[PDB]
């Protein structure tokens, strides 16, 4: 079966520019059964470009398709931000129909500094028989962070999960949370739960803890 | 507007028969087709799963064609899809798609899509809320943060509100994650000035539809 | 049904009375002729067709009928004069574990004109792209089987229909009607009616 | 219901050609007529501007017939109006009107009217909101007042809401005025009791369609 290998993974630009994304294949496919689609996170997918030469109804006159034979590309006329979503490609020419990985586009901005906010466990949570340490990381542009807990100068891992939100509609930032779920057997002994924050924008490693 | 109606969510046991339908009106022209594509949270599409009403010619993928089957019905114009041997890897959203076709010729691409069907296989528990009162050491002057933790819930029809709904800005609700046991856990924080603390006291409000529990 | 044969029996009279009465009939209707007095007319040529249809498509082969069989496999004009002859073949056109030996055209560009037989095995395009001799999304196969099985309902019984098309054109007629005779009464003054003289 | 559809608003430069249409179905009887009347904000009507489809007989006013022209079309049933040499005195709403006529005789008065067309000739800028926090001297006991000032905006599709829309009484929005530069400026105040101050703090919400800016 024919597979799709999308080369551009992440490509950030500025509103008012031109972006070029491509979705090639391994072998040579027929240039008469190609279809581009647009899917918004939290909605239903729709058709964007069918046949690689003709546009669909309702689509603005800015999505121009190019490429033939083995390599295809999609050009944007003007980057007016209203479709900052992940695009996909489909080759419905052979019997096995396959798709691509995904091309996400984000907004480019200056590197900001994340804010550190640690929260100790609650009394009701300890009375219920559980414990959790929360370290909040908000207002950071680069979506590449790493947090390593320091529990009594011991590097802990595995029992830790992180959740990242999407971009806002005011400044296009991100939010990072980390919960350290631990039982009372290890909470009555260990008391220092540091949150090591290592970010590209922060020159000095900020680390907050409590007792 | 030409649209395709799809069924809602459904919870099943680890291994049973599931039937998802997609009713439409264009399925009475002896030339229409409908595909069944699966998409997980973040993962791209998986397969095609197409069927042509009329001259039935089925064609599945390599991993498929061993535990899945798709049937057709032209009397009522409703499609069907059966998937047996359900294991802990089908937790995704199923979509429906069918191109607009006439009585003699069809189009050259998929135009109309469906709505979606969420299928989750797990147990059920009772929701609970734990306080997340702020600390006196995290305050740096005019910048505070607080929230509420909700865990032990199989369904997540949860909406975050503050001050009995009298707040719109400063809300940052984190998506839900799946723990090792099988229960979800969300997170929500709010950024309020430190000067407001100690004067106006408020709490957090949650909502769970399958249990009708609010704090 | 898509490839119907045609026979031309002529040069002698019609004596359709030794057909063992065709015990299973299920369909006996004459459009523009009366079954009582029908051999009293001389015809030139008589045509007959042969095909097999299902149970839920018997009333489709008639003047002024639309559908997929009456427009893509066999169609009759509005000016037709004849009877209906058909019978059931559920005990012959059925074998063990399904019988797949009959085909029929389902997809076509336009409708067929009256008295038109097409045996083309070309692919049909339902879009705007060429098929290029390979099945795809906008190219299907217009021929399929019927899946005749003995364990079925009355809407699956096969009906072999023979379509008589009595014709009388501008030439010596040949399909007339049979005649009888009496004995030879001699020595009596009586009436005689020979072939041409009276 | 028999109605006459008219085009929407349009912004032009100081001096160009403008085309306003008024489509209807009664304009295919060779005896129907349609008038074009202009009405400013507060000022009464100005002229007639009528035209008879068929035997073309135009008749304008004294100020007109030198820079305006009206044409007709019976094929599609849509009227046209062209006005050249646009200066800073045509900022008003254009209306359409046509009496119901049969194929042999018409009525004796204008029955059906149109919708309206707003034409404004100016530049464009970006909206802005300035605070209008109350003063401690204007309070007289249970009678307070506050609002928000919005200036520097060419279009005015502005709606005033308070408490994120959770307020209906005590709303007094003043109409917009035209400054000497060319930018508009509105005013909106809310009457709340003085006892509510210092306990429940709220803000003001604005909306601008051509810019999509909300505070």
Rounded to whole angstroms, the Cα distance separating D90 from A8 reads 54
A119-122 contacts at long range (C-beta below 8 A, 24 or more positions apart): A119/B132, A119/B134, A119/B135, A119/B138, A119/B145, A120/A210, A120/B135, A121/A187, A122/B130, A122/B131, A122/B132, A122/B133
Contact at CB, B33 and C137, closer than 8 angstroms? yes
Rounded to whole angstroms, the Cα distance separating A168 from A141 reads 11
Rounded to whole angstroms, the Cα distance separating A105 from A107 reads 7
Contact D24, D74 (CB under 8 A): no
A31 near C CB under 8 A: no
Strand C104-105 to C85-88 pairing: unpaired
A53 near C CB under 8 A: no
Residue A125, Cβ neighbours under 10 Å: how many?
18
Contact list in A for residue C136 (CB cut-off 8 A) is 33, 92-93
CA distances from C24 to C20, C89, C95, C156 (A): 10, 9, 21, 16
Q: At D9, phi and psi to the nearest 5?
A: -70, 165
Between positions 34 and 73 of A, the ones with CB within 8 A of B are 35, 44-47, 50-51, 54, 56
Rounded to whole angstroms, the Cα distance separating A11 from A86 reads 11
A neighbours by CB contacts (3+ pairs under 8 Å): B, C
Chain C touches chain A, with at least 3 Cβ pairs below 8 Å, answer: yes
Question: In which region does residue A82 sit, left (phi positive, over 0), alpha (psi from -120 to 50) or beta (all else)?
Answer: alpha
CA distance C136 to chain A (A): 7
CA distance A122 to chain B (A): 6
Which residue is it, tokens 């100020």?
A: D63
Between positions 146 and 185 of B, the ones with CB within 8 A of D are 166-168
CA distance B170 to chain D (A): 13
DSSP string, D162-193: EGGG---SSEEEEEEEE-SSS-EEEEEEE---
Distance, CA of B88 to chain centre: 16
Give the Cα-Cα-Cα angle B184, A194, B148 (nearest 5 degrees): 35
Give the A:B interface size as CB pairs under 8 Å. Answer: 98
Residue C59's SS3 state is: helix
Q: At D79, phi and psi to the nearest 5?
A: -85, 165
Contact list in B for residue A93 (CB cut-off 8 A) is none
Question: Tokens representing B125?
Answer: 């528990």
Residue to mutate among B50, B52, B55, with most C CBs inside 10 A, is B55
Rounded to whole angstroms, the Cα distance separating D210 from D215 reads 15
* Nearest alpha carbon to residue A44 among B3, D42, B150: B3
Question: In which region does residue C156 sit, left (phi positive, over 0), alpha (psi from -120 to 50) or beta (all else)?
Answer: alpha
Rounded to whole angstroms, the Cα distance separating C50 from C48 reads 7
A113 near B CB under 8 A: no
Which residue is it, tokens 């219901």?
A: D1
Distance, CA of A84 to chain centre: 12
Contact list in C for residue A92 (CB cut-off 8 A) is 136-137
Q: At A116, phi and psi to the nearest 5?
A: -100, 130
Question: Tokens representing B22?
Answer: 């997609």
Rounded to whole angstroms, the Cα distance separating D48 from D60 reads 7
CA distances from B157 to A18, B6, B176, B208, D106 (A): 40, 19, 11, 6, 63
Contact at CB, B95 and A45, closer than 8 angstroms? yes
Contact B21, B118 (CB under 8 A): no
DSSP string, D131-174: EE---SSS--SS---EEEEEES-S------EEGGG---SSEEEE
CA distance C139 to chain A (A): 11
Distance, CA of A204 to chain centre: 26
DSSP string, C137-157: SSEE-SEE---B-SS--TTS-
CA distances from B61 to A1, A30, D209 (A): 10, 20, 49
Contact list in B for residue D163 (CB cut-off 8 A) is 166
Residue to mutate among A32, A35, A50, with most C CBs inside 10 A, is A32
Contact at CB, A138 and B189, closer than 8 angstroms? yes
Number of helices and strands in chain C (H, E): 1, 9
Contact C89, C106 (CB under 8 A): no
CA distance B166 to chain D (A): 7
Distance, CA of C78 to chain centre: 16
Residue C74's SS3 state is: coil
* Nearest alpha carbon to residue A194 among A154, A158, A159: A154
| Most distant pair of Cα atoms in chain A: their distance | 68
Could you give the count of Cα atoms lying within 13 Å of D185 in the half-sphere of its Cβ?
A: 10
Question: Tokens representing B146?
Answer: 């607080």
B201 near D CB under 8 A: no
Contact list in D for residue B197 (CB cut-off 8 A) is none
Question: Tokens representing A75?
Answer: 């050009």
Kindly identify which residue of chain A lies nearest to residue C129, measuring between CA atoms. A32
Contact list in C for residue A32 (CB cut-off 8 A) is 129
Residue B155, Cβ neighbours under 10 Å: how many?
17
Specify the DSSP element, H or E, that contains C124. Answer: strand C124-125
Residue B106, Cβ neighbours under 10 Å: how many?
22
Give strand ranges (E) for chain A. 4-5, 20-22, 24-25, 34-39, 46-50, 54-55, 63-68, 71-76, 86-91, 115-119, 131-140, 146-151, 161-164, 174-182, 193-198, 206-208
Contact A146, B170 (CB under 8 A): no
Q: At A178, phi and psi to the nearest 5?
A: -145, 125
Contact list in C for residue B31 (CB cut-off 8 A) is 107, 126, 140
Specify the DSSP element, H or E, that contains A125. Answer: helix A123-128
Kindly identify which residue of chain A lies nearest to residue C136, measuring between CA atoms. A93
Contact D119, D87 (CB under 8 A): no
Question: Tokens representing D31?
Answer: 């005896």
CA distance B213 to chain A (A): 18
Rounded to whole angstroms, the Cα distance separating D52 from D74 reads 11
Contact list in D for residue B166 (CB cut-off 8 A) is 163-164, 166, 200, 202
Task: List CB contacts of B169: < 8 A, sequence separation 6 or more.
Answer: none
Q: At D195, phi and psi to the nearest 5?
A: -70, -25
D neighbours by CB contacts (3+ pairs under 8 Å): B
Rounded to whole angstroms, the Cα distance separating A71 from A28 reads 9
Task: List CB contacts of D53: < 8 A, sequence separation 6 or more.
Answer: D27, D30, D31, D32, D33, D34, D72, D74
Residue to mutate among D162, D167, D196, D201, with most B CBs inside 10 A, is D201
Contact at CB, C138 and B106, closer than 8 angstroms? yes
Rounded to whole angstroms, the Cα distance separating A98 from A27 reads 13
Give the Cα-Cα-Cα angle C146, C147, C150 (nearest 5 degrees): 125
Residue D55's SS3 state is: coil
B200 near D CB under 8 A: yes
Gyration radius of chain A over CA positions: 23
Nearest to B105 among C126, C137, C144 (CB): C126
Contact B39, B45 (CB under 8 A): yes
B neighbours by CB contacts (3+ pairs under 8 Å): A, C, D
Alpha-carbon dihedral sign for residues D162, D167, D171, D176: positive
Give strand ranges (E) for chain B. 5-6, 10-11, 18-23, 33-39, 50-52, 68-71, 78-83, 93-98, 112-113, 117-120, 128-132, 146-151, 161-162, 171-178, 184-190, 204-205
Rounded to whole angstroms, the Cα distance separating A57 from A91 reads 21
Could you give the count of Cα atoms lying within 13 Å of A153 in the half-sphere of its Cβ?
A: 0
Task: List CB contacts of A1: < 8 A, sequence separation 6 or more.
Answer: A94, A96, A98, B62
Rounded to whole angstroms, the Cα distance separating B142 from C55 reads 84
Nearest to C127 among B30, B54, B106 (CB): B106
Contact list in A for residue C137 (CB cut-off 8 A) is 33, 92
Contact at CB, A122 and B133, closer than 8 angstroms? yes
Contact at CB, B101 and C126, closer than 8 angstroms? yes
Residue A126's SS3 state is: helix
Contact A57, A12 (CB under 8 A): no
CA distances from D123 to A135, D9, D14 (A): 50, 15, 10
Task: List CB contacts of D9: < 8 A, sequence separation 6 or more.
Answer: D117, D118, D119, D120
Question: In which region does residue A2 sit, left (phi positive, over 0), alpha (psi from -120 to 50) or beta (all else)?
Answer: beta
Strand B204-205 to C5-10 pairing: unpaired
Q: How far apart are the first and last CA of chain C?
A: 51
Task: List CB contacts of D198: < 8 A, sequence separation 6 or more.
Answer: none
* Nearest alpha carbon to residue C86 among C4, C37, C29: C29
Residues forming a β-bridge with A198: A146
Q: At C21, phi and psi to the nearest 5?
A: 70, -5
CA distance B215 to chain A (A): 15
Burial D73-91 (b: 16+ CB within 10 A, else e): eeeebebebebeebeeebe
Rounded to whole angstroms, the Cα distance separating A67 from A44 reads 27
Rounded to whole angstroms, the Cα distance separating A121 from A132 reads 6
Question: Tokens representing A203?
Answer: 């020159």
* Nearest alpha carbon to residue B27 among B6, B49, B7, B54: B54
Which residue is it, tokens 């929230």?
A: B147
Reported resolution in A? 2.8
Contact list in B for residue A195 (CB cut-off 8 A) is none
């Amino acid at each position: 079966e024919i597979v799709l290998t999308q080369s551009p993974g992440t490509l950030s630009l500025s509103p008012g520019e031109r972006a070029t994304l491509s979705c090639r294949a391994s072998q040579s496919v027929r240039s008469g059964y190609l279809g581009w689609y647009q899917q918004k996170p939290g909605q239903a997918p729709r058709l964007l470009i069918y046949g690689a030469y003709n546009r669909a109804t309702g689509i603005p006159d800015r999505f121009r398709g190019s490429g033939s034979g083995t390599d295809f590309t999609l050009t944007i006329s003007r980057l007016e931000p209203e479709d900052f979503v992940v695009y996909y490609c489909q080759q419905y020419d052979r019997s096995p129909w396959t798709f691509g990985q995904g091309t996400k586009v984000e907004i480019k901005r200056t590197v900001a500094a994340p804010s550190v906010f640690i929260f100790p466990p609650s009394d009701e949570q300890l009375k219920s028989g559980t414990a959790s340490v929360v370290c909040l990381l908000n207002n950071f542009y680069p979506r590449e962070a790493k947090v390593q807990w320091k529990v009594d100068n011991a590097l802990q891992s595995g029992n830790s999960q992180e959740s990242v939100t999407e971009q806002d509609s005011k400044d296009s930032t991100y939010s990072l949370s980390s919960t350290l779920t631990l039982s009372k057997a290890d909470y009555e002994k260990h008391k220092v739960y540091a949150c090591e924050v290592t970010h590209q924008g922060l020159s000095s490693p900020v680390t907050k803890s409590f007792n | 507007q030409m649209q395709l109606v799809q069924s809602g969510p459904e919870v099943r046991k680890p291994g049973t028969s599931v039937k998802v339908s997609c009713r439409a009106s264009v399925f009475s022209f002896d030339t229409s087709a409908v595909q069944w594509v699966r998409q997980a949270r973040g993962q791209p599409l998986e397969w095609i799963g197409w069927i042509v009403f009329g001259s039935s010619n089925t064609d599945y993928a390599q991993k498929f064609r061993d535990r899945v089957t798709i049937t057709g019905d032209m009397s009522t114009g409703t499609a069907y899809m059966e998937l047996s041997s359900l294991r802990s890897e089908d937790t995704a959203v199923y979509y429906c798609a069918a191109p607009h076709c006439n009585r003699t010729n069809c189009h050259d691409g998929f135009d109309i899509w469906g709505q979606g069907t969420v299928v989750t296989v797990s147990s059920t528990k009772g929701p609970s809320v734990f306080p997340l009162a702020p600390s006196s050491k995290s305050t740096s002057g005019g910048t505070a943060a607080l929230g509420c933790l909700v865990k032990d819930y199989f369904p997540e029809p949860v909406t975050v509100s503050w001050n009995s709904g009298a707040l719109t800005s400063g809300v940052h609700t984190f998506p839900a994650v799946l723990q090792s046991s099988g229960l979800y856990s969300l997170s929500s924080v709010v950024t309020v000035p430190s000067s407001s603390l100690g004067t106006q006291t408020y709490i957090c409000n949650v909502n769970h539809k399958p249990s009708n529990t609010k704090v | 049904v898509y490839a119907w044969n045609r026979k031309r029996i002529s040069n002698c009279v019609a004596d359709y009375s030794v057909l063992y009465n065709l015990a299973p009939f299920f369909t006996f209707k004459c459009y523009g002729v009366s079954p009582t007095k029908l051999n009293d007319l001389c015809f030139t040529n008589v045509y007959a067709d042969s095909f097999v249809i299902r149970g839920d498509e018997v009333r489709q082969i008639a003047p002024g009928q639309t559908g997929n069989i009456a427009d893509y496999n066999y169609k009759l004009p509005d000016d037709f004069t004849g009877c209906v002859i058909a019978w059931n073949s559920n005990k012959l056109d059925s074998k063990v574990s399904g019988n797949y030996n009959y085909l029929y055209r389902l997809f076509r560009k336009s409708n067929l004109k009256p008295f038109e037989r097409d045996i083309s095995t070309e692919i049909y395009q339902a879009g705007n792209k060429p098929c290029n001799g390979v099945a795809g999304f906008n190219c299907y196969f217009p021929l399929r089987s019927y899946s005749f099985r003995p364990t079925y309902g009355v809407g699956h019984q096969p009906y072999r229909v023979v379509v008589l098309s009595f014709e009388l054109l501008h030439a010596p007629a040949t399909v007339c009607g049979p005649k009888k005779s009496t004995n030879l009464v001699k020595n009596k003054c009586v009436n005689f009616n020979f072939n041409g003289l009276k």
